[PDB]
Amino acid sequence: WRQRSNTQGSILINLLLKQPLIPGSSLSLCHLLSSLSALREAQNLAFTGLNLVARNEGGRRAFPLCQLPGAVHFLPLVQFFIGLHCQALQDLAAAKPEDSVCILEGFSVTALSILQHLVCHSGAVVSLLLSGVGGQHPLLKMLLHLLAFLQASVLTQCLKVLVKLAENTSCDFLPRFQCVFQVLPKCLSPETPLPSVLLAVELLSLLADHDQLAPQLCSHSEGCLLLLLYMYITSRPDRVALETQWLQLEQEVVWLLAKLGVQSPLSNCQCNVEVVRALTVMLHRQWLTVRRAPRTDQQRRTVRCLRDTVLLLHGLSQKDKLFMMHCVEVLHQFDQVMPGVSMLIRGLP
């Protein structure tokens, strides 16, 4: 706390101060920061809130985020900006010019992403989101409405903000969050970008946090929402993801698959059949690594990926009662996977 605590808040204020601190944004805060008069009052209040942050410096806390009445006031000014972005989203639905109105909403969304960083920085903004209308914050509820609606990247950033809130957020807050997920699974698309897919993996982490989210499951196959998302993960086309970066998104997916097994609760499930196919896709990446036969950080990651695969292989036998049957469909790949595993054993120290 004390001076160090003040500095961390100041750094968060500094990120808002940088213009545009967000890439692709002409300014962040300042001209970007500022009834039109009510919004102007909010902008003046936001400057005051930053001044208040300057004036004043285990698991539930997670990373400590400073909570200030002034931080809440700055958040309220942010909420007014969010309302202008939310109004822009409603205007876009009316719209059939509109892109410029959308660009202003995107500016606000970039502002929200700074706000999301601010939420990681400040406990108070997260607590206000946690309180909700009574639940999701009414300002949070407007963000959920934006979620219902470059814009997709802003939505992914909002999802990232929710994920940051989730590590701070209580499991109960995650339950209030839950069913936003029920719409979110519908929102997720093969078309949607891989960075957004990484955000979806964060959403999967959110599901682990809430017991009701844990209750939603890959098992029950197609009828289950989780199995269909898992099947998309299993396909691993990763067309948006490029090279090592495509592998890194896959590595995040592997951590999420590992997490469900780690959880006590976790074709009868479409996802379990998809997972044997997914393991084969990982095996194809492993085979390319085997041909290379880990100075590269990605190469070190590939050795890590092989270790993840070894945990995955015990899981894969658990996933399908016909473990051999899943292998037979993926068996030609599986024989390659055994060769990759021998290369991996040489890699292992």
Partner 1 sequence: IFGVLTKELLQLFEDLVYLHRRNVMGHAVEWPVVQLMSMQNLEFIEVTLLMVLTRIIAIVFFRRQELLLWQIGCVLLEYGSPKIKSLAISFLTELFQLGGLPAQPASTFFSSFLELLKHLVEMDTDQLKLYEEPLSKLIKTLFPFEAEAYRNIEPVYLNMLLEKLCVMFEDGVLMRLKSDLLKAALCHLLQYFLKFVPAGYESALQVRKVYVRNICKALLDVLGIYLLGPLYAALKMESMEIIEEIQCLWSALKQKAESLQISLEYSGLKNPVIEMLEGIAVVLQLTALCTVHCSHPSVVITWMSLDFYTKVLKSCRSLLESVQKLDLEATIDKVVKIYDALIYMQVNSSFEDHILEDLCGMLSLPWIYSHTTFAANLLTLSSPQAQSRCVFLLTLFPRRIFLEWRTAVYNWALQSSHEVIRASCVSGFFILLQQQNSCNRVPKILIDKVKDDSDIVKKEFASILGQLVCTLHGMFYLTSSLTEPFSEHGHVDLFCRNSQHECQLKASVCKPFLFLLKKKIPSPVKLAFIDNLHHHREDETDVKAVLGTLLNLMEDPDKDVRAFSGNIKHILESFIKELFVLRMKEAYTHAQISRNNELKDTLILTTGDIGRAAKGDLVPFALLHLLHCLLSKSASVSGAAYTEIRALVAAKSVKLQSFFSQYKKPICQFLVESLHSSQMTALDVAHQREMALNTL
Partner 2 sequence: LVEMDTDQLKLYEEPLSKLIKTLFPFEAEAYRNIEPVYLNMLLEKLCVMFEDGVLMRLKSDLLKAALCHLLQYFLKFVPAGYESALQVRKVYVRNICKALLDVLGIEVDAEYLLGPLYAALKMESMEIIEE
45 phi and psi angles, rounded to 5 deg: -65, -40
Sign of CA dihedral 107, 112, 115, 116: negative
| Site for partner 2 contains 23 (CB under 8 A) | yes
C-alpha span between 303 and 72 (Å, rounded): 45
Whether 57 and 6 have beta carbons less than 8 Å apart is answered as yes
Q: Smallest distance, Å, CB 68 to partner 2? A: 11
**Count of other CB atoms within 10 angstroms of residue 106:** 21
Contacting residues for 70 by C-beta, under 8 A, at least 6 apart: 48, 49, 51, 52, 53, 55, 56
| Site for a copy of itself contains 48 (CB under 8 A) | yes
Q: Smallest distance, Å, CB 11 to partner 2? A: 6
| Site for a copy of itself contains 103 (CB under 8 A) | no
| Site for partner 2 contains 211 (CB under 8 A) | no
First to last CA, the chain: 42
C-alpha span between 286 and 114 (Å, rounded): 38
Applying CB under 8 A, which of residues 1, 25, 33, 64 lies at the interface with a copy of itself? 33
CA distances from 221 to 224, 258, 272, 313, 349 (A): 5, 18, 8, 20, 38
Q: Which stretch binds partner 2 (CB under 8 A): 48-56, 89-97, 151-159, 172-180?
A: 48-56
| Site for a copy of itself contains 20 (CB under 8 A) | yes
Q: Smallest distance, Å, CB 225 to partner 2? A: 42
Q: Smallest distance, Å, CB 192 to partner 1? A: 19
R_g of the chain, CA atoms, integer Å: 22
| Site for partner 1 contains 202 (CB under 8 A) | yes
* CA-wise closest residue to 53 among 110, 123, 114: 123
- Which two structure tokens, joined as six digits, stand for 199? 């955000």
| Site for partner 1 contains 18 (CB under 8 A) | yes
Pick between residue 108 and residue 122 the one whose CB is nearest to partner 1: 122
| Site for a copy of itself contains 31 (CB under 8 A) | yes
| Site for a copy of itself contains 44 (CB under 8 A) | yes
Whether 262 and 205 have beta carbons less than 8 Å apart is answered as no
| Site for a copy of itself contains 54 (CB under 8 A) | yes
Residue with tokens 């945990």: 311
Degrees (nearest 5) of the Cα angle 317, 323, 328?
135
| Site for partner 2 contains 172 (CB under 8 A) | no
Whether 33 and 20 have beta carbons less than 8 Å apart is answered as no
Whether 191 and 227 have beta carbons less than 8 Å apart is answered as no
| Site for partner 1 contains 15 (CB under 8 A) | yes
Residues 264-303 close enough to bind partner 2 by CB under 8 A: 297
Question: Footprint of partner 2 on this chain (CB under 8 A)?
Answer: 8, 11-12, 15, 18, 22-24, 41, 44-45, 48, 51-52, 55, 69, 73, 117, 297
Question: Footprint of partner 1 on this chain (CB under 8 A)?
Answer: 4, 7-8, 11-12, 14-15, 18, 21, 42, 45-46, 49, 52, 55-56, 58-59, 62-64, 73, 117, 120-121, 163-164, 166-167, 201-202, 204-206, 208-209, 252, 254-256, 258-259, 261-264, 287, 291, 293, 297, 300-301, 304, 307-308, 311, 331-336, 338-339
Question: Footprint of a copy of itself on this chain (CB under 8 A)?
Answer: 2-4, 6-7, 10-11, 13-14, 17-21, 26-31, 33-34, 40-41, 43-48, 50-52, 54-55, 57
